[PDB]
Nucleic acid binder design. Structure first.
Ligand code: K
Ligand code: K
Ligand code: MG
Ligand code: MG
Ligand code: MG
Ligand code: MG
Ligand code: MG
Ligand code: MG
Ligand code: MG
Ligand code: MG
Ligand code: MG
Ligand code: MG
Ligand code: MG
Ligand code: MG
Ligand code: MG
Ligand code: MG
Ligand code: MG
Ligand code: MG
Ligand code: MG
Ligand code: MG
Ligand code: MG
Ligand code: MG
Ligand code: MG
Ligand code: MG
Ligand code: MG
Ligand code: MG
Ligand code: MG
Ligand code: MG
Ligand code: MG
Ligand code: MG
Ligand code: MG
Ligand code: MG
Ligand code: MG
Ligand code: MG
Ligand code: MG
Ligand code: MG
Ligand code: MG
Ligand code: MG
Ligand code: MG
Ligand code: MG
Ligand code: MG
Ligand code: MG
Ligand code: MG
Ligand code: MG
Ligand code: MG
Ligand code: MG
Ligand code: MG
Ligand code: MG
Ligand code: MG
Ligand code: MG
Ligand code: MG
Ligand code: MG
Ligand code: MG
Ligand code: MG
Ligand code: MG
Ligand code: MG
Lengths: 200, 115, 64, 142
RNA sequence: UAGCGGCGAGCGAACGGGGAGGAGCCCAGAGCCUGAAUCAGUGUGUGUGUUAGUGGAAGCGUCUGGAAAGGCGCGCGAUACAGGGUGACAGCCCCGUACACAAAAAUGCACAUGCUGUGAGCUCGAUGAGUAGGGCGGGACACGUGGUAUCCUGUCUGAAUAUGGGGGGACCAUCCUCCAAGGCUAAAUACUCCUGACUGACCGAUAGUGAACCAGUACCGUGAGGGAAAGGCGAAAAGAACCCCGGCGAGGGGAGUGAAAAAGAACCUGAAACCGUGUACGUACAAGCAGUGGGAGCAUGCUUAGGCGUGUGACUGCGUACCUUUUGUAUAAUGGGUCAGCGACUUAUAUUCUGUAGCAAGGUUAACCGAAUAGGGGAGCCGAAGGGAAACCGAGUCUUAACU
């Protein structure tokens, strides 16, 4: 169970999803994979093929005392080369469904022991204004947060773009690195119901 | 990502040239030449940690052999005389007592005379 | 791309349950009247490839 | 806490990087000897080349022929028998449960392990050891 | 994989299944009846968007410094802390940014839409000849003439024409299938010379385009063509008034600007090789990879009233460079004048093996749809049973007439 901060109602939350042991390797793998998937990998040099130069042997093989060459595009010359020029490549990697789910379960289970996870009832701002949202965190006594809601109110989102230490999401769009990065986490009783039912 | 390797080279060259600091000609100044000199210096430094122990041991024996023949005995008999009376004093010290306390060195030659 | 099989090897070998490859013996196509029967009988049944020359077979036909 | 996460012991293995000094162990010839075809870039030899000797896969004679009928027949394992519809498992209903491939007209039930419910098989080949089991469970074939 | 193949090297399908995507019709013509579906243009409507745009929130008192955004204390806006500037790091000084509104004309469009112009429903009847096929020679199909189907043909030929003809991988006979020798046709797909945004575990002047600089320039070549090098003063030119030496010079020295002129146009920093000037010691009877171990002297600093450190190194034991290649190198075998910079086991996809994590008689998805690094999508793959050339049998089976 998890008692609320303005009700004291017995929320029968599942034990198999939230009462778990931490698995650092899996979490690390998923959090690395998520970062590696964020790469766009747009980059290119040009090998001796793609360099703009003549084929011509600059000087003949023998006769001259100089060191045998056959290109002004060869990597050992100033201008033109880069032996192993990288191409634009897809750095993202496969993560197994159950690995990913298991990692989210494992990190979401740890927040109950850390007490970073704050479960709440009907959480919604009155109007799209940061002045209200900024002030209402002082009463609740928080600061660096990840607000997660099932019923995604536009009022709450609109007035939390420019606020940086706050990040609003939908319960559908929870992430591995997102849950780990932010100090506190805020979840609505509907949102935890949706996440519980989603992860299972 | 590209790595310029200008900071690190001079770091590892300056380490070596600072060891060669003192050597004649290019061996001090020039890296290519210094590097060899620094290594050969190491080889010799290792090689002569062993020879240091030999040279001094010759040098002592010489002093003792000289100091004994003043009192009228050859080293070979002097050592055998000391060893036969179960005397445990090494060369290093005998060479010191040879130079310094000759009244004490005299008594060792008598101590050895018995055997 | 995918590894291509050395097809000539695929026809001359066959993968077994343990992992080895059965093959047909040589010296039994022609010039048989001079060969004794006792040879011709022993060159008939299929034979397992020796462990010495297995690494060649594993490489040239990897897919089964 | 993001920076606190570390992998399992023996998970990451560093990897060999060649040609990087003496202390590296490998370095000057990246673990590939002195000279010869194997040391050269793009070196080595094609698969199954014993140096001009007629390779094992040519000195041995080819045999047999690949049957077309063998590709369109399946070996149904008795453990995956009662996973369809009560006890009716002809062919198309067995195919619907993704136990055997699509283009497979003929199929055969062999012995493997465990029957509980009675299963009536029909329009399908069955093995004598299986037929003893399927009848011992209860279900009658055809 | 099946096949093809000096059956070598290699090449390598289709059926069938997931998706993306969807769409169908005219001519080889006659009746009643005809502008009604259909498009192809003209004017014409709003939903509108494109080439000028405009507005566009909120900061100060102190300390340090040449200069404040900095440290320091209370603030204050945020549907705007994307980003860029300003005399050091700016949410609030300025440009902007979201965000809300823009067009006289040129328009890119999609629906009403009058309309030179175009033809519906429905009868009866037709359904593409030097063609299909064949002989010869080539080619295309994964298929190299092979037992070789099928399409295209250069050459030589030649049908039947819906009580009819093609295909089903030599070929033949019943069944299934379609209708060649006449035509059109959007979308999914490829591509970026090009005009805008926006992002980079992309580069930062030997890199990145050959080209950050008036570069495809100089220069080279008869020509095709080849083809360089060359970035940064400062916050701001405030780019040094005037004296001095000097050839009414070059260059310098004072004065003066500036925070700083060993920031003065060669102008941030300013390494190394290289060449210098002083200071200390050594060096003109001494042989050689020039060091190393010992080592007096001499020159010098500290605390103590005696010990330590740095520099030099007389004399003396040992001591024939480094790399490569080699049975073996001081070799008189190779390579290097030196310094600084760049310069060599990479990437993608398959595959096996080891580790490691997940889950386990199960494991896993590809493309793709997707408020999208979630979740759907198990098409498929791999495994859970093999044996046999194969039919086939299967905890066995193959061999064999049959196996102790
Ligand atoms: K403004
Ligand atoms: K005609
Ligand atoms: Mg020369
Ligand atoms: Mg030269
Ligand atoms: Mg380049
Ligand atoms: Mg490179
Ligand atoms: Mg160092
Ligand atoms: Mg076999
Ligand atoms: Mg055998
Ligand atoms: Mg190693
Ligand atoms: Mg090693
Ligand atoms: Mg080694
Ligand atoms: Mg070599
Ligand atoms: Mg050799
Ligand atoms: Mg070799
Ligand atoms: Mg031969
Ligand atoms: Mg299936
Ligand atoms: Mg080809
Ligand atoms: Mg404006
Ligand atoms: Mg201030
Ligand atoms: Mg401030
Ligand atoms: Mg500054
Ligand atoms: Mg307008
Ligand atoms: Mg207008
Ligand atoms: Mg026709
Ligand atoms: Mg024809
Ligand atoms: Mg024919
Ligand atoms: Mg061909
Ligand atoms: Mg036919
Ligand atoms: Mg035909
Ligand atoms: Mg047929
Ligand atoms: Mg047609
Ligand atoms: Mg088109
Ligand atoms: Mg298209
Ligand atoms: Mg980045
Ligand atoms: Mg960089
Ligand atoms: Mg350049
Ligand atoms: Mg430059
Ligand atoms: Mg520079
Ligand atoms: Mg400037
Ligand atoms: Mg004059
Ligand atoms: Mg200065
Ligand atoms: Mg200069
Ligand atoms: Mg500056
Ligand atoms: Mg300068
Ligand atoms: Mg000089
Ligand atoms: Mg002298
Ligand atoms: Mg000499
Ligand atoms: Mg001399
Ligand atoms: Mg000597
Ligand atoms: Mg020697
Ligand atoms: Mg030499
Ligand atoms: Mg010489
Ligand atoms: Mg060499
Ligand atoms: Mg030379
Ligand atoms: Mg089998």
């Amino acid at each position: 169970e998890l008692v609320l901060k303005d009700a004291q109602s017995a929320l029968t939350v599942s034990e198999t999803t939230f009462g778990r042991d931490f698995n650092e390797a899996l979490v690390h793998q998923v959090v690395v994979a998520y970062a590696a998937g964020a790469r766009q990998g747009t980059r290119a040099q040009k090998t001796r093929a793609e360099v703009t130069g003549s084929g011509k042997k600059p000087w003949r093989q023998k006769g001259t005392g100089r060191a045998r060459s056959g290109s002004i595009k060869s990597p050992i010359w100033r201008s033109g080369g880069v032996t192993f020029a990288a191409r634009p490549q897809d750095h993202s990697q496969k993560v197994n469904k159950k690995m990913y789910r298991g990692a989210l379960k494992s990190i979401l289970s740890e927040l109950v022991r850390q007490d970073r996870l704050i479960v709440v009832e009907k959480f919604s701002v009155e109007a799209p204004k940061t002045k209200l949202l900024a002030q209402k965190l002082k009463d609740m006594a928080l600061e660096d947060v990840l607000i997660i809601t099932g019923e995604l109110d536009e009022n709450l989102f609109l007035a939390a773009r420019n606020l940086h230490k706050v990040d609003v999401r939908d319960a559908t769009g929870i992430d591995p690195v997102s849950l780990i990065a932010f100090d506190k986490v805020v979840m609505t009783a509907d949102a935890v119901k949706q996440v519980e039912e989603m992860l299972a | 990502a590209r790595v310029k390797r200008g900071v690190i080279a001079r770091a590892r060259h300056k380490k070596i040239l600072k060891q060669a600091k003192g050597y004649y000609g290019a061996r001090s100044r020039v890296y290519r030449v210094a590097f060899q000199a620094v290594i050969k210096a190491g080889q010799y430094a290792y090689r002569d940690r062993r020879q240091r122990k030999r040279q001094f041991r010759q040098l002592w024996i010489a002093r003792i052999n000289a100091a004994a023949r003043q009192n009228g005995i050859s080293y070979s008999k002097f050592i055998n005389g000391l060893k036969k009376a179960s005397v445990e004093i090494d060369r290093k010290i005998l060479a010191d007592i040879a130079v310094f306390d000759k009244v004490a060195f005299t008594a060792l030659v008598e101590k050895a005379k018995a055997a | 791309p995918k590894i291509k099989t050395v097809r000539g090897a695929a026809k001359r070998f066959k993968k077994t349950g343990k992992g080895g490859f059965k093959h047909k013996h040589a010296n039994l196509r022609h010039i048989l009247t001079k060969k004794a029967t006792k040879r011709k009988r022993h060159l008939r049944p299929k034979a397992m490839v020796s462990k010495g020359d297995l690494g060649l077979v594993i490489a040239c036909l990897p897919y089964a | 806490r993001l920076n606190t996460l570390s992998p399992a012991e023996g998970s990451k293995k560093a990897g060999k990087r060649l040609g990087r000094g003496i202390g590296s162990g490998l370095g000057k010839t990246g673990g590939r000897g002195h000279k010869g075809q194997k040391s050269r870039s793009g070196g080595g030899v094609r698969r199954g080349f014993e140096g001009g000797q007629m390779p094992l896969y040519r000195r041995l004679p080819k045999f047999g022929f690949t049957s077309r009928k063998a590709a369109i027949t399946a070996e149904i394992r008795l453990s995956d028998l009662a996973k369809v519809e009560g006890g009716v498992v002809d062919l198309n209903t067995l195919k619907a449960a993704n136990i055997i491939g699509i283009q497979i007209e003929f199929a055969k039930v062999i012995l493997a392990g465990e029957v509980t419910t009675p299963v009536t098989v029909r329009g399908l080949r069955v093995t004598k050891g299986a037929r003893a089991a399927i009848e011992a469970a209860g279900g009658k074939i055809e």
